[model samples]
Target: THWYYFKLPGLSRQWKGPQEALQEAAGAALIPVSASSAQWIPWRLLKRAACPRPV
Candidate 1:
């Protein structure tokens, strides 16, 4: 449910801890783009490896 429209109980007060609140807020904020792009890492062949570069 949307947090903005949520109703607190009679005993409820301010929001929860910052970390928890922020995490939820971040998740909610990222819901539109949470499907991150793919990542690819190529593996070097056993005989093609080289020592560290001078750069």
Candidate 2:
């Protein structure tokens, strides 16, 4: 089962792969914290979304 990580300030959502998750995160201004590789994606999240616009 392939997957990716999307994150917003103070929380996160795990989803099945990139396409849908990318759109969903971008729609809500979340950040992409993983890729299409087989590496063990970390369970960490942004300490905060920060003050920048998509920084």
Candidate 3:
């Protein structure tokens, strides 16, 4: 969680975009990426991730 997004284009596998970068960060989290998240993170995920949790 607590994620951020930068702009990406083409969703290419060239390792040159933020979309690929976020996917890389997820690393098999059993969740599906946008398959084209070159714009933003989903509001739900963002909110949950950023929500306060017990420490």
Q: Which candidate number has the best lDDT?
A: 2
What lDDT tens digits, residue by residue, belong to model 2 across residues 1-55? 1233334334446443241222223224223444643222233522222232333
Residue 32: error of model 2 in Å? 13
Q: So what's the TM-score on candidate 1?
A: 0.15
* Model 3: CA > 4 A from native: 9-55
lDDT score of model 1?
0.21
**Backbone clash count for every predicted candidate, in the order shown:** 0, 0, 0
lDDT of 1 by residue, 1-55 (tens): 1112111223334532111111233213111111452111111100121334356
Best by TM-score: 2
RMSD of model 3, in Å? Answer: 10.7
- Residues 1-55 of candidate 3 have per-residue lDDT tens digits of 3333232333433322122223423322222245642433333232123334569
Which structure is stronger by lDDT: 1 or 3?
A: 3
Candidate 2: where is the Cα deviation over 4 Å?
1-36, 45-55
For model 2, give the RMSD to the true fold. 11.4
Against the unseen true structure, what C-alpha lDDT does each candidate score? 0.21, 0.33, 0.32
Clashing residue pairs, backbone N/CA/C < 3 A, model 3: none
